[PDB]
Design a protein around this ligand. Structure first.
Ligand code: MG
Ligand code: MG
Ligand code: MG
Ligand code: MG
Ligand code: MG
Ligand code: MG
Ligand code: MG
Ligand code: MG
Ligand code: MG
Ligand code: MG
Ligand code: MG
Ligand code: MG
Ligand code: MG
Ligand code: MG
Ligand code: MG
Ligand code: MG
Ligand code: MG
Ligand code: MG
Ligand code: MG
Ligand code: MG
Ligand code: MG
Ligand code: MG
Ligand code: MG
Ligand code: MG
Ligand code: MG
Ligand code: MG
Ligand code: MG
Ligand code: MG
Ligand code: MG
Ligand code: MG
Ligand code: MG
Ligand code: MG
Ligand code: MG
Ligand code: MG
Ligand code: MG
Ligand code: MG
Ligand code: MG
Ligand code: MG
Ligand code: MG
Ligand code: MG
Ligand code: MG
Ligand code: MG
Ligand code: MG
Ligand code: MG
Ligand code: MG
Ligand code: MG
Ligand code: MG
Ligand code: MG
Ligand code: MG
Ligand code: MG
Ligand code: MG
Ligand code: MG
Ligand code: MG
Ligand code: MG
Ligand code: MG
Ligand code: MG
Ligand code: MG
Ligand code: MG
Length: 189
RNA sequence: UAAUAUGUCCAUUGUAGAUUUGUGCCCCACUUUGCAUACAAUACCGGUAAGCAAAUGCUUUAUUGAGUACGAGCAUAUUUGGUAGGACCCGAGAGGCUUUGAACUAAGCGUGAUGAGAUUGAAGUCAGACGAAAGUCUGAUGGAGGAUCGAGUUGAUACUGACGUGCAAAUCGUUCAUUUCAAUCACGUUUAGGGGCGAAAGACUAAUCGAAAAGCCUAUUAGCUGGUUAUUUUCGAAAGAUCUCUCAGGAUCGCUGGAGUUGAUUAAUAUAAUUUUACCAGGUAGAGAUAAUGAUUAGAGGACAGGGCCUUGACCUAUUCUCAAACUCCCAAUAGGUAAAAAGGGCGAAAUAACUCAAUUUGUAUUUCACUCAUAUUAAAUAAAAUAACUCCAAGUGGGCCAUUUUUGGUAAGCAGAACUGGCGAUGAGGGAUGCUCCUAACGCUUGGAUAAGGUGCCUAAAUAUUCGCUCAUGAGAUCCCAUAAAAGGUGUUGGUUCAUAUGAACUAGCCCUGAAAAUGGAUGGCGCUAAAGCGGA
RNA sequence: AUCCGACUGUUUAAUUAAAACAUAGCAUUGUGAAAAGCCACAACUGGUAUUAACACAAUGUGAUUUCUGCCCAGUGCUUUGAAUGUCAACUUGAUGAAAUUCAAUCAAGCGCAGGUAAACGGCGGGAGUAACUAUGACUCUCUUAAGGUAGCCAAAUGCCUCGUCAUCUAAUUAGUGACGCGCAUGAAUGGAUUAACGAGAUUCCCACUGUCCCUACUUGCUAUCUAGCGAAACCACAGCCA
RNA sequence: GCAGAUGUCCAAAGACAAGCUCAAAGAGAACAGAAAUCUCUUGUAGACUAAAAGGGGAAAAGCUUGUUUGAUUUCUAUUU
RNA sequence: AUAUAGAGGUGUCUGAAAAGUUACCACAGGGAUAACUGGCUUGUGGCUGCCAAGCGCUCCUAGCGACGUAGCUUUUUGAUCCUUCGAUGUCGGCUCUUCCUAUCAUUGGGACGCAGAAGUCUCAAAGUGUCGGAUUGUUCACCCGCUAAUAGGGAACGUGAGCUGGGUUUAGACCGUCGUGAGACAGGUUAGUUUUACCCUACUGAUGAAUUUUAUUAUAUAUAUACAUAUAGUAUUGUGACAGUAAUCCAACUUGGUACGAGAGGAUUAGUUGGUUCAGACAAUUGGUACAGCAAUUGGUUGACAAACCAGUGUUGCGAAGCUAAGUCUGUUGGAUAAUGGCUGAACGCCUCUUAAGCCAGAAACCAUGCUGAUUAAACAAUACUAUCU
RNA sequence: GACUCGUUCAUACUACAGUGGAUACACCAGAUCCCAUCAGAACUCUGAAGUUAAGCACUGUAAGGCUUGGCUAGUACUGAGGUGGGAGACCGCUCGGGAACACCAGGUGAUGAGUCAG
């Protein structure tokens, strides 16, 4: 069925992805990535919490999926299903391989860096503690060393809260869905 | 067929080059000569092209030869090497050739012998009994049988008994199978080695058998194993590579020694695992995905298909999340190449040519003259740079392994496979308790000194030094490789950070505790150590 | 009671005594003779053979009982040959100045056409289908030289497997009797069955016992000590551990 | 180790020249439809180039046409 | 025939013209290379965590624990090929000892989805124990039964100069499949030599010298003295450092049909009597044993009777004594603790088992007591006499 | 002012606009001949009636692109050293070297030879 997961912890082997030279690779267990009110505006949620791994590791896709599930369920238990936005900001492309000689492809892995974020929760400023808790719970399921990190950003958008507010006040920013575009003074009239 | 070719006894032309000759006794800066040799260039000889072609073959053109251009060889002594031989020594299994054996054993034959004693009781025979008939029974006798049991004999079933440096290179004990027949034994005799003999086990053929023994061919051959003999000194490797019926070998390169030569000895030019100043060449690390390929998660904003103006879609547009060893707009570090001037370069003349051009001189290249280029700081440093080149002759080696870093396969491996460098191997010494590779440092023999790595409680030479913290452990901790520990905890203590109203939080990181279980007894190396002799410093 | 061999016999001298070999019986094949068969020998000659088809030689199977199915495409063996493809020397002819080069020819052998399995051997797969379901007499289909027949079986033949049901036991991966789409049974590779026999292989029952519970005592001979005599293998040096 | 490929194919798919521009998309035109042909617009190649894959290639190295055999003989310097 | 240039081909592609088998094998070698241990690794197996979606009537966590994740172990099988091919005897059983703990039972505890009983989870605990059988060569497995329980392991997958040799893995042979065949089988079946201790060490016992750079826990008449005592030889009695250790579990009944429970059921703890296993003895008694000894008797032999003898101890019967089990007897309790429960009591004005300082009760565990040795201490003391002693 | 041959080969491109045509370019007019096709569309030839409408030149766009520079950022990465840390994964320090995307701002050409018109 599966291996102890400690076999595919460290980033040994160069990134081996799904392409013309892999072919027979099973589907990743994680498919949703982002859930809980995914169609919300940028102005809807202000509190953004990240799950930053301080480990150069691989992270099974299945593990990631499990973590996501944990995050979701906890959120549901806590507040409304439409009061948060869960984003998995790491995708598994590096397909592992097993030998039963060159091994045959078996499952994918979501290899990470020392600085990059795993899970990101965009919620209202009221439910930040809950979000943090959820993140922590999720972490219990990843390998290595992770850390819950509340951001000064507005939510997924690369602007500080105050800055965002300022922008809104002078109308230099247009909100689409989750992501927002900043008017740069560049295009034609 | 056979080496300028009779203009001249002269001895082809260069560029560096020893020695000379002079000028101002080694360097200098010129002249002067130009050994050896290197590097070319020409001639010419043989062949072969090509062009011509009836000659003694001719040619302004090619190529090729182990050629030639004023000979160097021959002989011999020693040497190493390579080859043949017994071939450094010792070692096979075998192959053949000619003999010797059947006293053992195998079978056949000839002549002889040998099998205590019992048991069963076949035919035939005799007597008796019954039946309308056919016929059928009963008691003897008889002594048949590859019948039965069984001493001996011949064997060898079991104890897998004893013995197993025995009594014995197959024995002993008990048990067992065999005993009138395919029996057993003796003597004689026949059959002999790729042969015999075989109720067949490749059995046996003189303790020898899936091809005897003896001698010879033979000192057969072995890329394989073991061995391979005085001392000191000097130099000193490789375990790459290409080919190999090759992967335990060999051949040739590499690396090494010796021999020699040309040089250098003019703190120079040559040159250098080095750097600079120039100039390049890259596409790895990184970075990118709203740059292309391939992926890839979302919604937002928009204008073809389906259902009853709305919904589901796809499609654009602007975005967004994450990516690539076999993606790239870009692109390091490191590594690499050329450059940095006298056998040369400048600007010029005149030459020469069958080349080139439109230009007998348009240029090219060559040659001879000119003028003139830093130089003792030596055309940027620095250089125990000539200990250099080069040539020869050979040896060993061609199983490698380890460490940091980069790295591929592999769950991983003291695993397999690679890259750069260093080691070990070939290497001791001081340290790491102990150790082929870790650190220090490579080694003549001595004295004194001062260190390196590491240490300084004792073992153990050197501090129970000083100085500021941190740790208490009812399985502490103790220094690269290294001899393991983790996720997760901890109202243990010690600092912090962020917050709130001297408390309440949340975190955070040090030490410490839990998590933490394997087999002989037990290992920071031991003893021990807690105001450390622990951990982190100074 | 089961398995194997029928039996008496023989065998690997010194690890295998048997289920191996032999055996009678059965079956096959060749050969009518010194020009035959099978074999030996360098040769000439010889053996069988002082033989003659109830013989000799060569095989296979292995008493009896009961049977030995199907298949000659494959490989063998074998039978007919101027219809016959090929197939050698010689021969013969053509060519040439000749060497040669070419053609042609009734050899066997093979090819062509048969015969042969007690010669070597081999001997199917899928579907569908019967008043509660199952199974499939029966049907279709691809294909083979023939598609394994009578039997027999988890047999010394069964991987799965310690196969399912019985039976033996308190309990049985054993034994026995069944079952059988049998990886991969099977008919002189003989199949199936067998009385008697076996230092054969296997299981159970009764008797019997120190095999064992659970050891004890005892006897000879050794060991032991002495007198006498007196080796060897082995041995780098040696000999405590964590 | 990984993803593959080769033992060939071609009088042209060779040679030279000329002309032309491809894939795709959109908007159009009887039959005509998701593919038939034609036209225009846009078209850095997203086509095609004998085949593996990687280069390279646009008044071409692709496609169309014309003319042809240099897929010729001999010999060097050489690179892998 | 050459010369030159192509072509006919070597795909093992720098280019032999080439099929098998050996379980009948031989030789040279190889740990450059397998099957065995160990070693490295731990994928696999086994064991332990962490998180908590649920399950568990209600309830995340009594017990569980998905999705995940972190380890450890080498009792699995691999991976590996470092060690050994001038041999480390290759499975299993029997036998025997020790070690481990990842404890099945027993002791003490804590938790429960603990009313009692029974049980489940868990902690200190390895002191003591963990069987008889049927089938299989088996390890493993599966039953049957007893049991307090029938826990898991290791020690060169402990243990072949200990054995056994059933299997695997020689030669014989049979069957099935495979191969044209010789033969092959990680298919089945049967028959198939298990050599040597007398060496060193280790262990078990058995003697036994020697021991002055060696000793001394005092001696001597309140004072002395290590600037000191000590001869030796026998012999008795002791000392006892140190080493070894031993006892173990159950049943029945009484407590009690009581506590508890709606009821059915139904105990802890003591106490008593027994037993099991083990150990140490011992033999009155029972049995066992016979080459003390009597008695009988068979065949033979001495002329007979008698007395005997011989038959590897002739064979019986009985058999003292001596050994011996299947027989009999005996097999302690303190100290200090672990788990745990507490106590006083801060940190932290309360609380707090101390997750401070101090205490307390507490286990089949530990150490004593007890028991065995004590040329394990080269030990020593005291007495008794003696050869000269001062 | 314009053209021809060019050089660098986007500051030169593209998209949408605007402005300009003395000479020039260009479009355009015609097909006998050389020629080329399905087609005088192209190509070729012969012209000069018109026109800047396009080509072309020039300019504009809080243009796309490209090109310089800052800024990312001394961040990422990295050469050498370390008995440095960290169980490890990896991460500091010492001597050095040093990116990229994005972002912001500037820029949108220059030029060699010749000829022609005034
Ligand atoms: Mg596992
Ligand atoms: Mg790898
Ligand atoms: Mg010799
Ligand atoms: Mg030969
Ligand atoms: Mg004889
Ligand atoms: Mg005889
Ligand atoms: Mg025998
Ligand atoms: Mg014996
Ligand atoms: Mg003996
Ligand atoms: Mg044989
Ligand atoms: Mg020899
Ligand atoms: Mg030297
Ligand atoms: Mg060797
Ligand atoms: Mg990268
Ligand atoms: Mg990235
Ligand atoms: Mg790349
Ligand atoms: Mg060596
Ligand atoms: Mg060294
Ligand atoms: Mg050490
Ligand atoms: Mg160093
Ligand atoms: Mg000194
Ligand atoms: Mg000093
Ligand atoms: Mg000292
Ligand atoms: Mg101590
Ligand atoms: Mg110390
Ligand atoms: Mg028989
Ligand atoms: Mg024998
Ligand atoms: Mg027979
Ligand atoms: Mg028969
Ligand atoms: Mg038949
Ligand atoms: Mg014929
Ligand atoms: Mg049948
Ligand atoms: Mg039985
Ligand atoms: Mg049966
Ligand atoms: Mg068959
Ligand atoms: Mg017999
Ligand atoms: Mg001797
Ligand atoms: Mg063209
Ligand atoms: Mg090895
Ligand atoms: Mg594991
Ligand atoms: Mg050895
Ligand atoms: Mg031995
Ligand atoms: Mg041994
Ligand atoms: Mg425990
Ligand atoms: Mg329990
Ligand atoms: Mg209870
Ligand atoms: Mg083991
Ligand atoms: Mg032994
Ligand atoms: Mg033995
Ligand atoms: Mg054994
Ligand atoms: Mg056996
Ligand atoms: Mg055998
Ligand atoms: Mg008695
Ligand atoms: Mg007598
Ligand atoms: Mg008696
Ligand atoms: Mg405290
Ligand atoms: Mg205009
Ligand atoms: Mg712009």
């Amino acid at each position: 069925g599966r291996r102890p997961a400690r076999c595919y912890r460290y980033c040994k082997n160069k990134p081996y992805p799904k392409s013309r030279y892999c072919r027979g690779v099973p589907d990743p267990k994680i498919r949703i990535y982002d859930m809980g009110r995914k169609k919300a505006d940028v102005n809807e949620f202000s509190g953004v919490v990240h799950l930053v791994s301080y480990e150069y590791e691989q992270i099974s896709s299945e593990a990631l999926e499990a973590a996501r599930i944990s995050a979701n369920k906890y959120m549901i238990t806590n507040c409304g299903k439409d009061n948060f936005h869960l984003r998995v900001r790491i995708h598994p492309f590096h397909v592992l391989r097993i030998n039963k000689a060159f091994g045959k492809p078996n499952g994918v892995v979501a290899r990470v860096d020392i600085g990059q974020v795993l899970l990101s929760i965009r919620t209202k400023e009221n439910f930040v503690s809950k979000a943090c808790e959820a993140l922590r719970r999720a972490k219990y399921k990843f390998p290595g060393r992770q850390k819950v990190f509340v951001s000064n950003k507005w939510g997924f958008t690369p602007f500080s809260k105050d800055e965002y507010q300022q922008y809104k006040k002078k109308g230099r920013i247009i909100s689409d869905g989750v992501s927002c575009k900043f008017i740069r003074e560049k295009g034609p009239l």
